[PDB]
Design an enzyme around this catalytic site. Structure first.
Site, short mmCIF file in Angstrom:
data_model
loop_
_atom_site.label_atom_id
_atom_site.label_comp_id
_atom_site.label_asym_id
_atom_site.label_seq_id
_atom_site.Cartn_x
_atom_site.Cartn_y
_atom_site.Cartn_z
CB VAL A 39 11.19 68.58 3.08
CG1 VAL A 39 10.52 67.24 2.81
CG2 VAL A 39 10.46 69.70 2.37
CG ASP B 85 4.62 56.98 -1.45
OD1 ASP B 85 4.59 56.30 -0.41
OD2 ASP B 85 3.73 56.93 -2.33
CB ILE C 124 16.18 65.77 2.52
CG1 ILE C 124 14.94 65.16 3.20
CG2 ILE C 124 17.44 65.05 2.98
CD1 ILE C 124 13.69 65.17 2.34
CG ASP D 238 8.58 76.57 -7.91
OD1 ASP D 238 9.40 77.26 -8.54
OD2 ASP D 238 8.76 76.20 -6.73
CG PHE E 8 10.53 77.85 -1.71
CD1 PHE E 8 10.98 79.16 -1.58
CD2 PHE E 8 9.16 77.62 -1.74
CE1 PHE E 8 10.08 80.21 -1.48
CE2 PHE E 8 8.26 78.67 -1.65
CZ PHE E 8 8.72 79.97 -1.52
CB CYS F 160 11.46 61.30 -4.24
SG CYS F 160 9.84 60.83 -4.90
#
Ligand SMILES: Nc1n[nH]c(N)c1/N=N/c1ccc(O)cc1
EC number: 2.7.11.22
Lengths: 305, 252
Positions: free
Chosen positions: A26, A88, A18, A133, A23, A90
């Site tokens: 994850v 955490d 995800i 970024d 980039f 999101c």
């Protein structure tokens, strides 16, 4: 060998990517004992021949420092050999939301989003960090409706023999004029430019300046914000790449006009215009934008559902 | 956390190294030795004392977790410095650090061909070790040093350039010779440094108009009973250290 302060990432059950498209590499994951949801970023070691990447050291330094309701939260770092950053979790990214057609934003909610975003920027700048970024994809939102800035990969501390910061920063579409005119002595004002593009994106649902090359980007920016004249932007001369490459000459500011149709709210348009200013020294800062009548008129900023 | 890397005396005695039969005194040498190796490399590698100090602190904490009988100082020290240099913005190339660590530990031997396998290994070893240091420290690589607060301390006493330089000297040397970095927060160590620098230079600072002592503007928890207790221990080991005091000894 003993290791009391670096847990094995095996304590987290992986779930799904995800994702690599943002980039970074994850995963979503679940604490095997409590269900707690987290994001695991692997530290990529391909083509790294100098031990643990100096890049990852920066990021970890920065995240360990940046503790704030509107900045993504590093919980710990995990091992396995390979190393994982753990956050955490999101649930949403602002880009996924803006492209999804079933998702719909009221003026008060958009106010709230921009507010959190700008408030988060205020914090990192105050802490002498540049994000570098800014883009919809890097603005996360939690299931309970809290916005978090994320991906501090190109992040960097700043301070005050002028400065020589890297110039190849910021995705092309959210990159400001300073960096296209080859500037290397910049700061906070760059992130706020992105904040601008993102804000506009909130009504247009699509990035508003999608260039192919850097010269095409500067091209589009002028067709919206006016030409780069020292009349508008004092001392824009000293930049070698000034005349060296193109630019236009007859462009008059069409920011409010071109966006009028999408945005609607007068105060909204007014704030976008001060964020998308050409001269960084004249571009609104995060404090003054949080104080702009946009956030202090009706409807008032509300929570998210 | 706030107290993860600060230990009691009872805790320093029961070190991982003690648990493998290393006497209390030898552990201390082992530390000092690593410190010296870091300083020697650090100067040849042309990095700052800040970097060397950061490396020395990594080394100190590292040995509150790992034992000297499993990790030899001469292996940790270079990896530690390799790491510090990246962290403090003075990266040195992996091959460059190995090169230098070699001539430091083997002044006589010649560097193997960087094509051999016995070299390709000692490169993989460093990298591996840096990883073990990171995990051991739990990626807490941001170090506060007593030096930061020395300016703020010496600015008060309006001390000469001389008392200042001497105070930094005390700072750096405390890292080499003691385990203060493991027991007292930078600002306290900083006080201990100034205090002793004063005693040594004979400098005496008058009590302020407020009635407050010079150090209360530096740390709420500092008391003369501690400063004297510490500066004594620091001075003692400085006297045991050959040629060290000579560097700040007034020869006039
Ligand atoms: N926390 C998260 N939930 N979902 C994400 N994509 C996500 N990303 N987090 C990141 C990603 C990259 C980074 O450098 C720091 C935090």
């Amino acid at each position: 060998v003993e290791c009391p302060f670096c847990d094995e990432v095996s304590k987290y059950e992986k779930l799904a990517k995800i994702g690599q498209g943002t980039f970074g590499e994850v995963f979503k994951a679940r604490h095997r004992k409590t269900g707690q949801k987290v994001a695991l970023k692997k530290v990529l070691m391909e083509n790294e021949k100098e031990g643990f990447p100096i890049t990852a050291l920066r990021e970890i330094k920065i995240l360990q420092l940046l503790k704030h309701e509107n900045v993504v939260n590093l919980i710990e770092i995990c091992r396995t050999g390979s190393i994982y950053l753990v956050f955490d979790f999101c649930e949403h990214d602002l880009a996924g939301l803006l492209s999804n057609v079933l998702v719909k934003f009221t003026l008060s909610e958009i106010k709230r989003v921009m507010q959190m975003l700008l408030n988060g920027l205020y914090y990192i700048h105050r802490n002498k960090i540049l994000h570098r970024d800014m883009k919809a994809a890097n603005v996360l939102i939690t299931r309970d409706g809290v916005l978090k800035l994320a991906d501090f990969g190109l992040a960097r501390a700043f301070s005050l023999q002028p400065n020589r910061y890297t110039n190849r920063v910021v995705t092309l579409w959210y990159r400001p004029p300073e960096l296209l005119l080859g500037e290397r002595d910049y700061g906070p004002p760059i992130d706020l430019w992105g904040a601008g593009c993102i804000m506009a994106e909130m009504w247009t649902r699509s990035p508003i300046m999608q260039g192919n090359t850097e010269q095409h980007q500067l091209a589009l920016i002028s067709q919206l914000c006016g030409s780069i004249t020292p009349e508008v932007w004092p001392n824009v001369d000293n930049y070698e790449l000034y005349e060296k490459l193109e630019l236009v000459k007859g462009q008059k500011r069409k920011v409010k006009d071109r966006l009028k149709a999408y945005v609607r709210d007068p105060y909204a348009l007014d704030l976008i215009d001060k964020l998308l200013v050409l001269d960084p020294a004249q571009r609104i800062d995060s404090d003054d934008a949080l104080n702009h009548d946009f956030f202090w008129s009706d409807p008032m900023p509300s929570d998210l559902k | 956390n706030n107290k993860r890397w600060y230990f009691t005396r009872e805790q320093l005695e029961n070190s991982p190294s003690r648990r493998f039969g290393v006497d209390p005194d030898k552990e201390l040498s082992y530390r000092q030795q690593a410190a010296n190796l870091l300083q020697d490399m650090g100067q040849r590698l042309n990095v700052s004392q800040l970097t060397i100090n950061t490396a020395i602190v990594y080394m100190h904490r590292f040995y509150m977790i790992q034992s000297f009988t499993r990790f030899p100082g001469n292996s940790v020290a270079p990896a530690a410095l390799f790491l510090a240099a990246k962290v403090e913005g003075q990266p040195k190339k992996l091959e460059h650090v190995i090169k230098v660590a070699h001539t430091c530990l083997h002044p006589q031997e010649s560097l193997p061909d960087t094509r051999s396998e016995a070299y390709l290994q000692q490169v993989q070893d460093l990298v591996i070790l840096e990883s073990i240091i990171l995990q051991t420290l739990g990626f807490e690589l941001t170090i506060d040093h007593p030096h930061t607060h020395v300016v703020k301390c010496t600015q008060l006493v309006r001390a000469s350039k001389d008392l200042a330089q001497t105070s930094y000297f005390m700072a750096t040397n405390s890292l080499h010779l003691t385990t203060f970095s493991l027991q007292y927060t930078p600002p306290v160590v900083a006080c201990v440094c100034i205090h002793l620098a004063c005693k040594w230079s004979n400098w005496e600072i008058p009590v302020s108009t407020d009635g407050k002592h010079w150090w209360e503007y530096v740390d709420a928890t500092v008391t003369l009973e501690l400063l004297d207790e510490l500066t004594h221990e620091l001075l003692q080991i400085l006297e045991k250290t050959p040629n060290r005091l000579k560097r700040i000894w007034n020869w006039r």
